[PDB]
Amino acid sequence: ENPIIAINMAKIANKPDSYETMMKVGPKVCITTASHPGFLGFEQLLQTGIHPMAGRYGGGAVDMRETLNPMGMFQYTVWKDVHSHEEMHHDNFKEIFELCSGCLGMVIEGPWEPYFEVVKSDLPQIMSMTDVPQVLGDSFAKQERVPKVALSSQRTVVIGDHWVMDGHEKAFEQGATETLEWMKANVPGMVGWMIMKQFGVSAIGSFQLDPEGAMKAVSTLGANPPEYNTNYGNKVHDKPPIPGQTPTQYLVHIEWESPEHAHQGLGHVMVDYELRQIHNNGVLAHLDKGPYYMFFSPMMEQGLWRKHLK
Amino acid sequence: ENPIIAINMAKIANKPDSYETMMKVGPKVCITTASHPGFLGFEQLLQTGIHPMAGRYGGGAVDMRETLNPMGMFQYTVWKDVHSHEEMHHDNFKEIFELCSGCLGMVIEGPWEPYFEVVKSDLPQIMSMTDVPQVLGDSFAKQERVPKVALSSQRTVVIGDHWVMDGHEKAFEQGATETLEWMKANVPGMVGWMIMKQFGVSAIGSFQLDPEGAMKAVSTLGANPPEYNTNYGNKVHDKPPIPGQTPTQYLVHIEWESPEHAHQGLGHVMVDYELRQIHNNGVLAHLDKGPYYMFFSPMMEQGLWRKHLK
Amino acid sequence: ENPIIAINMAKIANKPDSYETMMKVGPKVCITTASHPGFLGFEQLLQTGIHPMAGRYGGGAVDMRETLNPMGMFQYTVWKDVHSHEEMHHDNFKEIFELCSGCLGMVIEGPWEPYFEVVKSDLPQIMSMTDVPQVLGDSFAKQERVPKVALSSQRTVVIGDHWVMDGHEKAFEQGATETLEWMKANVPGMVGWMIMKQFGVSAIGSFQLDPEGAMKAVSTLGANPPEYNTNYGNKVHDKPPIPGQTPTQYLVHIEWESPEHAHQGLGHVMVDYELRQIHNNGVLAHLDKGPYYMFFSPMMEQGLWRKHLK
Amino acid sequence: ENPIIAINMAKIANKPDSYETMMKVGPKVCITTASHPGFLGFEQLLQTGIHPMAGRYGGGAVDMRETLNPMGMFQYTVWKDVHSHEEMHHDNFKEIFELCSGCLGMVIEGPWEPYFEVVKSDLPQIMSMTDVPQVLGDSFAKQERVPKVALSSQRTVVIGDHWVMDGHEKAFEQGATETLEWMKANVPGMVGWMIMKQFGVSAIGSFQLDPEGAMKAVSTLGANPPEYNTNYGNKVHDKPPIPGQTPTQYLVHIEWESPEHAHQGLGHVMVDYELRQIHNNGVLAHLDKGPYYMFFSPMMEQGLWRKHLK
Ligand SMILES: [Fe+3]
Ligand SMILES: [Fe+3]
Ligand SMILES: [Fe+3]
Ligand SMILES: [Fe+3]
């Protein structure tokens, strides 16, 4: 099972009111989403900082939790296919509109919800500390490898934004794969990774309605939604209505034990000679833009989608 | 061996004095209880909060330790049979009356002590961190499965209150079992579970005496107990004197690594599509009341009773 | 005319926001309720404490207004019959859902809404001080007995929770009657009384929906209600869908001039020999649980239902 | 290897100055002791509290670190035989005298240094967290049982003082053995145990000199020691010069993960029916005095003596 991942990207005000509405409205959006049989899971990621990359982004820091405003908020929803996500949005349009109408009071930019293909991954199941002895015992019984420990809602997620030169997509994919496999084998605290390729955008999920829907959307506080409609019509799409951007965007999702392991870990592409060659030739040579690494904390996860990858 | 569980339910004042008397008198009652050969163990549970269930109980919170008053206090005592518990209460009536007379100064509601049958369970033995390597080694030697780690007095116990529709008891038992097994296989930090069915109540354990005994009970500070007697007479009963309530009450006992794991873990019946179908059709469809989940911390435990379940 | 009383029982957070939402939304619910021709009146009761009963509940107090959290909130709605209440809930389901969706942010437990039969009563009409001279004169004119003065929203309501042993219902009713008639003749400040017998529960009124309705109820902030439906179907019932609990619950409703009169007055079942014999043999001898007395202040009242009792 | 343990028992002032002289002088004494080939290791134990034993010692507490003054200080030195300890004391008499002369400024009672036989033990080797995976792997390789984890200078040591009735010594040893073996199999956080029998006292180690030596001992600040001599003369003894006390003293040394595990764990001899019979009949039935349990922290350990026990 190679699912599709829709990533709802927003930048929200960094103030206590925003954390309150995320804890009150967030669960309700996930509950509505999980009414659909194609829904496989989610990751709610709150930005905590960036990788300064040895001064390339010297105004930032690994830990900007006190200073970042707006802060990024990424919601992965994981689906059997694009149609399931678009259909869920259509079937629950009124209710999601009512909910997101609450969220818009903290929104500074977005939402923008691209669809991503999981090109390749090595992501363990999430678990807790008290699960580890049984996971260990089960692995020996099944003669399977014990995974890296991905602590549920207790680890660091890093996302590297890459724009890849036209025609370099495959070279980038193999080079990123080789980089990440080396890191998982050799760098302390590397929990797992996933290479994501944007191939389209959800119009409904990005609040990109037809002109009349856009008017009605601000003519209400949430109780009187617009009609389901976009600049691509009002039917439920099998393929993303909005084309993927070019140059092709790849999101490199890397999980680490902690922010320090992530900061020191990503730095190996500069301070280990062999990894530097792999990354320079396999990734950097193929970029129009990036890499740029944002640090996130997983606030809530429903991680069963990880159980059926590869 | 499936033992019987008497659950003494009380609501006590949340103030320093209450913690004082729980540590001074609490042990003394258990010492009295452990004189009887039918006594198998106990659990002292102090309420710490509730599951707000996506705003269904929005005035509450996972962590209400500072604001809850009264706070729930559940005392499990585990027995070979009902007769053992009634006999212990009869044989030690004067001393338990003396001890509990001190405890009534912190009581706002209760006590009420129903009897519960353990319908099904998957509960590991309790241990501590420094036991875990040896438990791992012993499991492998014995070719047995390593359990989830249930840390003695260092984890979260959640109790979900369900009233089941007349005639739906067996369907509920099968649905709850299937829900809990899925959760233990798939949700991080789920330590164990137990399904409990109320089938009667102890009159003596609930402080429900005959009228003259009730008068004498408050005509003393503890040194001059009433005669052992109830509205069901003064004999030691083989079966609970007070019938189980209808609609049938089931308590779903779930242990978790922490309050956060319990909160997010219980949420999976709403945000995982597959678990949602199991729980909706196997549990929610059979309820007159609930579910309502109270969070507890195990203050003191004598957990050998867990060793002979199933 | 002996009406039916639905008592919506909830426990709410004791904090300033809860009094605020009670003042903005509370009236709106009553206005919705009064659209139905079967609606006879209401009592909004806010818990102020308990009766400690000479140390039987020594952790509580007559006045717990500052410390009780959650605090009980009981709403009586009085009806010609069960069908009228169920029909009101059905016809106004969308609006009651919108209104109560707001209240859930202060709810810690509940709502649970049982139906009660008025077994017997001696309750005066409510009035104010400036009404008393005319009530006195009118009583003399009509040669009627002058009532106890029940000051509108200015007196104490106490509710005694009793669980009666199977088969003892009639003995309890007569014994409670004799106790309450003695107290009204002999105890200072006793304003009136009513014996209520639980015979069923409203599913819709207890927010106990079918499973999909339960999911949808938390998939909205109030503007997108679930369909009217329960585990007992979607028809408007003539009889309570949910059976009354067993052992039979009786609530003894007693009105008093003030909390001090209630505390001292209820104590007469222990400190007056003659009343003690009546209450011991006529009430206490027939109980599985209780008695437990909660103290309430009537916040808002529409008391015309009292005009047609007896 | 059945070594003998000399336990230097003192009570020292609980004030900052005492910890300093323990850090400046403490190591120097151990270095002197380790000059002798019969020296096997040491345990430096500082009292942190007591077990109140359900109110039998209600003035005490598990944690008395701020209030105990004086506080117990027990120094185990472990020897191939009595002669080795006496010879070390003789060969280093001047230097030990100089060092201990400094220690006497914090001494309120003691030192008293009895000799103990290790009657039976189940004591693991000490290790640290970062050793645990390798100890686990080594245990599987050698087909051996994984031990309880005894963290070096990071766990709780409890000592139970028992005076045994004349003629009951062997029965006490068996009953204590049965108690401890049950606890280690069944009680969370029990790291290990050792049963120690006092069979003599060192005169030199207890600072019990001949009368002229006692005079000179206080006629100096440490630089002019008395001649090596006692009320048993000035030879190096093969056997303890001072007889063991009667009634025979036994010290039950039990190691626990933490004070909470020790407190709850020891309580099982009262709150578990089966262990209660074992301890009542096997231990309590044979005592003139006790049990009295003091809580200690191991401040410094040289634990290789544990490696050759059993
Ligand atoms: Fe979406
Ligand atoms: Fe009991
Ligand atoms: Fe209602
Ligand atoms: Fe010595």
Automatic annotation (TrEMBL), chains A, B, C, D:
InterPro entries in the cross-refs: Dimeric_a/b-barrel (IPR011008), S_Oase_red (IPR011661)
Swiss-Prot/TrEMBL keywords: Metal-binding, Oxidoreductase
SUPFAM superfamilies referenced in this protein's UniProt entry, alphabetically: Dimeric alpha+beta barrel (SSF54909)
Species name: Halothiobacillus neapolitanus (strain ATCC 23641 / DSM 15147 / CIP 104769 / NCIMB 8539 / c2)
Amino-acid positions noted as binding Fe(3+) in the UniProt annotation, renumbered to this chain: 85, 89, 113
Upper lineage: Bacteria, Pseudomonadati, Pseudomonadota, Gammaproteobacteria, Chromatiales
Residues the record lists as Cysteine persulfide modifications: 30, 100
A molecular function (GO) term: sulfur oxygenase/reductase activity
Known EC number: 1.13.11.55
Any one Pfam family match given in the protein's UniProt record, by short name: SOR
Superkingdom assignment: Bacteria
Protein name as catalogued: Sulfur oxygenase/reductase
